[PDB]
């Protein structure tokens, strides 16, 4: 896999209880590095990785501004999308927005993407050309037209191709000690007897970064340790693939 | 870094 800079934006309308909830989280690869929560008193972008704690106020001012602007545009979008679907004011609804750029082995732009989802279901998607949008619904068609007429894609393309890449480079550098350092799984198998008749084998992987991994031989979803690393196991030899070890350990 | 201008739906 390739280096990336992604953000995951969530807006939730709160009928009766005032302005919608809004949260943005920034990830380089599988490391989270920033957060904005609008439920704070004076809501600001904050660092959420030790290598971001040395950034000046110029940076946090700007990201705080972007996030606040986003939160306000998302508030309007929720109200607008309500009208499109002829839903009442009484019910809570969700707008989500993921966007990210990826580098190739050459450290150049490789691909960008953006997607909006309304109440868990895809709504509007940026196309690979980074020049046009694709609706799913009829509702999303008014959005496509509106976005198209607005040249919304011109803005997102410059972000994805130039900004998102220039800043991904700055983040990989500021936190090289942690982001470029690989950590392969520590593997072992454990014996769990169900009776004298049947037994259960469990292939463990622990303390690995990044979270991409395959356990081959009941497959449990990859999960975080809370120290930056990840954990996984499979159950019924066991083959373990991860970009941190030269060949699959069996 | 965030994009300034979240798209308008």
């Amino acid at each position, epitope marked *: 896999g390739s280096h990336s800079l992604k953000y995951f934006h969530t807006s939730v309308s709160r009928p009766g209880r005032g302005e919608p909830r809004f949260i943005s989280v920034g990830y380089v690869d599988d490391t989270q590095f920033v957060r904005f929560d609008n439920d704070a008193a*004076s809501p600001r972008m904050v660092p959420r990785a030790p290598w971001m704690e040395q950034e000046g106020s110029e940076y946090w001012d700007r990201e705080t501004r972007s996030a606040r602007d986003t939160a306000q545009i998302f508030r309007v979008n929720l109200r607008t999308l309500r009208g499109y679907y002829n839903q009442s004011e009484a019910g809570s609804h969700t707008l989500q927005w993921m966007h990210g750029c990826e580098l190739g082995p050459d450290g150049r732009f490789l691909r960008g993407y953006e997607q909006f989802a309304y109440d868990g279901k895809d709504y509007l998607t940026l196309n690979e050309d980074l020049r046009s949008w694709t609706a799913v619904d009829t509702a999303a068609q008014i959005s496509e037209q509106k976005s198209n007429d607005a040249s919304e894609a*011109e803005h997102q393309r*410059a972000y994805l191709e130039d900004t998102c890449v220039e800043w991904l480079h700055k983040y990989l550098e500021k936190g090289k000690e942690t982001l470029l350092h690989l950590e392969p799984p520590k593997t072992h198998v454990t014996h769990h007897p169900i009776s004298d008749h049947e037994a259960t084998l469990r292939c463990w992987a622990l303390g690995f970064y990044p979270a991409e991994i395959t356990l081959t031989w009941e497959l449990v979803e990859t999960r975080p340790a809370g120290d930056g690393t990840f954990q996984k196991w499979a159950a019924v030899t066991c083959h373990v693939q991860h970009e941190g070890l030269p060949e699959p350990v069996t | 870094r965030l994009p300034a*201008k979240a798209p*308008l739906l």
Partner: T-cell receptor
Framework: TGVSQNPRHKITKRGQNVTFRCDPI?????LYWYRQTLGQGPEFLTY????????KSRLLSDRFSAERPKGSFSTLEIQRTEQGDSAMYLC??????????FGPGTRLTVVE | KEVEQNSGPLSVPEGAIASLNCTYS??????FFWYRQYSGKSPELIMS????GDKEDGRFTAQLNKASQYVSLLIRDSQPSDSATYLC??????????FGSGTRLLVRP
């Protein structure tokens, strides 16, 4: 909803104080204050992101000040008003860094 | 100045195409705006352009050239009702707007 500004015209005696108000478009979070004189373009004074005043002109006079207490309406106050303060005081709102739409302005004449 | 406009009076006979032209310094400027401002009135937004090429609205055309860093306004069938100062406004890579000094158009009836 357009951008409201009152008064539209204001006569004040040199040395007096004046206070203009602007109401932006409902869903617009940014509010900008500009001044304009004959055959020049709008000159930046200050802007607000909701309640937060994020910037002011490097050259802004100590006599000029603005507030947006409730993050809604904004007031611009000129103290000890001078002849040279005579100009068009434009307010503009925007939804993030989208288009800036202007109010009908407050024209201040400062008379002897 | 970040944004340049010939301020001098532009005189044009009724029915000619008026060519308003504006030049901006920041090669990565993000959005580009034409405001109409009648004497004693506030600026009215008439064209918004972002992408290389042309936007059309009535007798108005906006032309954006990011390579030459030119932005133009064309007024087809120019009427004296179009006599006004036309303000060029550009938002830089950071999305910070600048208003040029404007160009005074005078459509001779």
């Amino acid at each position: 909803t357009g951008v409201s500004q009152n008064p539209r015209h204001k006569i004040t005696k040199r040395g007096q104080n004046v206070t203009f108000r602007c109401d932006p478009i409902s869903d617009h979070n940014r509010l900008y204050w500009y001044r304009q004189t004959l055959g020049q373009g709008p000159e930046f004074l200050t802007y607000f992101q909701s309640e937060a005043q994020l910037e002011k002109s490097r050259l802004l006079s100590d006599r000029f000040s603005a507030e947006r207490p409730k993050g809604s309406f904004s007031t611009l106050e000129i103290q000890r008003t001078e002849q040279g303060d005579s100009a068009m005081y434009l307010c503009a709102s925007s939804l993030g860094p989208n288009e800036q739409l202007f109010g009908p302005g407050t024209r201040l004449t400062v008379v002897e | 100045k970040e944004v340049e406009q010939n301020s001098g009076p532009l005189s044009v006979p009724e029915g000619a195409i008026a060519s308003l032209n504006c030049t901006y310094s920041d090669r990565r400027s993000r959005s580009f705006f034409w405001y109409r401002q009648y004497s004693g009135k506030s600026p009215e937004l008439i064209m918004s352009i972002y992408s290389n090429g042309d936007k059309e609205d009535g007798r108005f055309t906006a032309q954006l050239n990011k390579a030459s860093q030119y932005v133009s306004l064309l007024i087809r069938d120019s009427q004296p009702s179009d006599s006004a100062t036309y303000l060029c406004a550009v938002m830089d890579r950071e999305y910070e707007i600048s208003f040029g000094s404007g160009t005074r158009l005078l459509v001779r009836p």
